[PDB]
Structure 1
Amino acid sequence: LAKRIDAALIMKDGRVVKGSNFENLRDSGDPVELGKFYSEIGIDELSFWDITASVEKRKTMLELVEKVAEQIDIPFTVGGGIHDFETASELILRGADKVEINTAAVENPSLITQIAQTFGSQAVVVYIAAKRVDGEFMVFTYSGKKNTGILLRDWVVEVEKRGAGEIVLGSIDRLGTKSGYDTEMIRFVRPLTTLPIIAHRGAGKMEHFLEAFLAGADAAKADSVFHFREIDVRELKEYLKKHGVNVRLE
């Protein structure tokens, strides 16, 4: 397949957290308008991650999914506190193509299988946040607050066994940096799974995306570098095509 470029949007109370610099938009903090714009200039898939306070979270997330599905024609994923099958199910039925889970999947891996039984493996994305600890890649939950003691190597294999469709590999060792994706981690994981691997954390310039695809990533996901216009999505795709990467061009 072609290599995918994904844009992630953090959301709270129906707004893009910290907005975006796209002066041309009516509302640069409007997740729907911004995702529609990204879909027009060349992003392949969108991810939305909600951090709304529990009282309004369920209906805020369902309303977002509904508005996005009407307005955009590329696949999109929703996540943020999805803890059970009925919550994932209503978000998929309401419009999302995929649901993203992490901590809830670590604590109950059968939740992967439960969702895949009704919506297909392709509807399940498992985010794996990993960090070096004493020379081993370990899995972390609760926004990186908890070292689970589960080896990355073992969790990847279990996630595919349980029926997940894709893995987002987020390197806590690259959080808040602009040094590049964790290509050592990507090369570690690549021989362990047949599933699509989405690289996350570390992006600072176009060349980093090339490095991630040489490391075996099937997609690369970024956020602030896009929203704050440090990297132009069309220039990135032109750059990657120029140097031999198969990406989808318009």
Structure 2
Amino acid sequence: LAKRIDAALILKDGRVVKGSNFENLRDSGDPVELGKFYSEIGIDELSFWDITASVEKRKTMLELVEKVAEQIDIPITVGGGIYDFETASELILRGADKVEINTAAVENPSLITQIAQTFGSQAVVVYIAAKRVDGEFMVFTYSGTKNTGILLRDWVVEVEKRGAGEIVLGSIDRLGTKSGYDTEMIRFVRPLTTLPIIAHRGAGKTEHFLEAFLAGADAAKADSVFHSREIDVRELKEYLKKHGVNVRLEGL
């Protein structure tokens, strides 16, 4: 089974938040240059996650996408406060391959279907932020701060039913940690959906990616661990290929 390695860039005001340690780049915190550089060294897909809280949010995300679409030739996902079909449509028409939704999907699951009905399920990504609460995995919205009371197991099933193309499974229990992906969470979700599962949060070293794929993840997404160069993308892919993981190195 083919496995995907994704890099995610957190953005604010058109800049990579907390930047990156790639001194070779003209601008360590330029999302476009960093994204191009990742696409050239072996990343399979890019996520651009906006946390801009300004009145300029829509215009900027749209500006960024159009620029990114020029320079970058691997799949692009945009996410972060995308709340309705018209916003999602604008971003896709401007060049995003996939749009990622979360809080708006949870509150209005019809939105998944609206996007999928026009652009295809493959254009739709649902980010599910989950956390253990009193012995059960629960869904959290608004940047991980609202306990919805919705069970992870129920929401995964509804997400597929509504027409989502893939699920990013972010463990709030691994937020900021470097101990490993939440493989218990990934194993919990795996039998519940036929969609691709993208693991997010907890990655600290190359072996963690192997564990995530053994747990049934189809893809593994990371951010700071890459930007900080704690893990080198090419080294990661060589490692995974060495131990029998079907990763794409057939690049050039």
User: What is the TM-score with the length of structure 1 in the denominator?
Assistant: 0.99
Q: CA deviation at 1:53?
A: 2.5
Matched, 1:249 2:241: no
SS for the counterpart of 1:167 is: strand
Give distance in 1, aligned partners of 2:27 and 2:172. 31
| Structure 2 CA distance for aligned equivalents of residues 174 and 12 of structure 1 | 23
C-alpha displacement of 1:173:
0.5
Superposed CA offset, 1:210-233 (max 9, x none)? 000000000000000000100000
Relative to structure 2, which stretch is displaced further, 174-183 or 51-60?
51-60
How far residue 63 of structure 1 moved from its aligned partner, in angstroms, is: 0.4
2: distance between equivalents of 1:20 and 1:212? 24
Residue aligning to 1:25: 25
Residue-by-residue CA offset, 1:188-216 (whole Å, 9 max, x unaligned): 00000000000000000000000000000
Q: Please give the alpha-carbon distance, in whole angstroms, between the structure 2 residues aligned to 1:61 and 1:53.
A: 11
Q: Over residues 35-80 of structure 1, what are the superposed CA-to-partner deviations in whole Å (9 max), with x where a residue is unaligned?
A: 0000000000000011112311111000000000000110010011
2-structure distance, mates of 1:147, 1:10: 23
| Structure 2 Cα separation of the partners of residues 19 and 147 of structure 1 | 30
**Structure 2 counterpart SS, 1:190:** helix
- How many residue pairs get matched? 250
User: Secondary structure, in 3 states, of the residue corresponding to 2:9?
Assistant: strand
Distance (whole Å) between structure 2 residues aligned to residue 199 and residue 109 of structure 1: 22
Offset, 1:143: 1.1
Cα distance in structure 2, aligned partners of 1:215 and 1:99:
25
Q: Deviations over 1:157-193 (max 9, x none)?
A: 0000000000000000111111100000000000000
Structure 1 partner of 2:172: 172
Q: Residue 239 of structure 1: SS of its match in structure 2?
A: helix
CA distance in 1, matches of 2:80, 2:140: 16
Deviation for aligned residue 1:2: 1.4
SS in 1 for 2:139: strand
Using the alignment, how far apart are the partners of 1:130 and 1:11 within structure 2? 22
Q: CA shift at 1:6, angstroms?
A: 0.2
Match of 2:26, SS?
A: coil
In structure 2, how many angstroms separate the alpha carbons of the residues matched to 1:142 and 1:52? Answer: 14
Q: CA deviation at 1:144?
A: 1.3
Per the normalisation by structure 2, the TM-score is 0.98
Percentage identity across paired residues of the two chains: 98
State the alpha-carbon separation in 1 of the partners of residues 52 and 129 from structure 2: 21
Alpha-carbon distance between aligned partners in 2 of 1:144 and 1:238, rounded to the nearest angstrom:
34
Please give the alpha-carbon distance, in whole angstroms, between the structure 1 residues aligned to 2:138 and 2:123. Answer: 25
Partner Cα separation in structure 2 for residue 178 and residue 77 of structure 1: 24
Structure 1 residue 89, shift from structure 2 partner: 0.2
Matched residues in 2 for 1:52 and 1:146: separation?
A: 19
Provide the rounded CA distance (Å) in 2 between the counterparts of 1:2 and 1:31. Answer: 27
Runs ≥4 residues deviating over 4 A: none
Q: Distance in 1 between matches of 2:6 and 2:38?
A: 10
**Following the alignment from structure 1 to structure 2, what is the Cα–Cα distance between the partners of residues 230 and 13?**
26
Displacement of 1:107 after TM fit?
0.2
- SS of the aligned residue for 2:19 comes to coil
Distance 2:138 2:79 in 1: 22
Across the aligned residues of Structure 1 and Structure 2, the Cα RMSD in angstroms comes to: 0.6
Q: What do the CA deviations read for 1:99-144 (whole angstroms, capped 9, x no partner)?
A: 0000000000000000001100000000000000111000011111
Post-superposition offset of 1:9 = 0.2
1:150 partner SS: strand
